[PDB]
Design an enzyme around this catalytic site. Structure first.
Site, PDB file in Angstrom:
ATOM      1  N   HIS A  99     -10.066 -51.288 -25.295  1.00  0.00           N
ATOM      2  CA  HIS A  99     -10.032 -52.398 -25.938  1.00  0.00           C
ATOM      3  C   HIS A  99     -11.003 -53.236 -26.077  1.00  0.00           C
ATOM      4  O   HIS A  99     -11.359 -53.836 -27.242  1.00  0.00           O
ATOM      5  CB  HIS A  99      -8.845 -53.575 -25.538  1.00  0.00           C
ATOM      6  CG  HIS A  99      -9.431 -54.553 -24.308  1.00  0.00           C
ATOM      7  ND1 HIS A  99      -9.468 -53.994 -22.813  1.00  0.00           N
ATOM      8  CD2 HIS A  99     -10.009 -55.644 -24.357  1.00  0.00           C
ATOM      9  CE1 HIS A  99     -10.199 -55.099 -22.313  1.00  0.00           C
ATOM     10  NE2 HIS A  99     -10.233 -56.231 -23.080  1.00  0.00           N
ATOM     11  N   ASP A 156      -8.744 -45.949 -19.556  1.00  0.00           N
ATOM     12  CA  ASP A 156      -8.940 -47.106 -19.963  1.00  0.00           C
ATOM     13  C   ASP A 156     -10.761 -46.863 -20.449  1.00  0.00           C
ATOM     14  O   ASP A 156     -11.389 -47.529 -19.690  1.00  0.00           O
ATOM     15  CB  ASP A 156      -8.812 -48.332 -19.351  1.00  0.00           C
ATOM     16  CG  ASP A 156      -8.904 -49.319 -20.342  1.00  0.00           C
ATOM     17  OD1 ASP A 156      -9.360 -49.198 -21.850  1.00  0.00           O
ATOM     18  OD2 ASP A 156      -8.625 -50.535 -20.207  1.00  0.00           O
ATOM     19  N   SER A 189     -14.180 -56.791 -18.059  1.00  0.00           N
ATOM     20  CA  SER A 189     -13.642 -55.452 -18.405  1.00  0.00           C
ATOM     21  C   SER A 189     -14.751 -54.710 -18.849  1.00  0.00           C
ATOM     22  O   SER A 189     -15.639 -55.267 -19.567  1.00  0.00           O
ATOM     23  CB  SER A 189     -12.638 -55.700 -19.387  1.00  0.00           C
ATOM     24  OG  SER A 189     -11.414 -56.322 -19.031  1.00  0.00           O
TER      25      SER A 189
END
Length: 196
Positions: free
Chosen positions: A39, A78, A154
């Site tokens: 993301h 991810d 993140s």
């Protein structure tokens, strides 16, 4: 654990391998090549948006680099590769301004780790912080660790006691956080996608 300290001068290894995106963190693994979450890589594509090499409150820049492209890991993990254009609009060379972090080749539960990145970066003028903790669980490409982390972390590298890369943070629950643990398979993907 909550032991979180600002790295005010990130020009030194291993902090000079850490990069700031809008919205989170990545780590440099080789020539023109950054690892982060999907993301972070993808979203930064919407505004397509520069990355800042080891931004810190007191260090000499760094430089801010335009993204060339991304390569998303095909699986559920991810994980994404981000390639930058080597020369910034201010004439700085990415590879002369970062270091390439070495792989740990795994870790053990109870190992002491550091998560380094930009928690609340938008609120701090992108101060770099190092947060220490312990690995609590490892299963396949999944790990859990208890270093304090926040939005902004993140994509943060999780480093071992020798400054080697174990994986990257992708989720909180906090002092109960989750990472992509770099198995041989993930290491191969990353290395295969470093620019020559």
């Amino acid at each position: 654990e909550k032991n979180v300290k600002e790295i005010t001068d990130a020009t030194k290894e291993p902090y000079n391998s850490v990069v700031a995106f809008v919205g989170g963190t990545g780590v440099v693994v080789g020539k023109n090549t950054i690892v982060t979450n999907k993301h972070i890589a993808k979203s930064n594509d919407i505004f397509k948006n520069r990355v800042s090499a080891h931004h810190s409150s007191k260090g000499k820049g760094g430089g801010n680099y335009d993204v060339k492209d991304i390569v998303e890991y095909p699986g559920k993990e991810d994980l994404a590769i981000v390639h930058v254009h080597e020369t910034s609009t201010e004439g700085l060379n990415f590879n002369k301004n970062v270091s390439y972090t070495k792989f740990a080749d795994g870790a053990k539960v109870k190992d002491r780790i550091s998560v380094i990145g930009y928690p609340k970066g938008a609120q701090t003028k992108y101060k770099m912080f190092e947060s220490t903790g312990t690995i609590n669980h490892i299963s396949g490409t999944f790990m859990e660790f208890d270093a304090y982390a926040q939005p902004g972390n993140s994509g943060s590298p999780v480093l071992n006691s020798k400054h080697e890369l174990i994986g990257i943070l992708y989720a909180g629950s906090s002092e109960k956080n989750f990472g992509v643990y770099f198995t041989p398979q993930l290491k191969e993907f990353i290395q295969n996608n470093i620019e020559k």
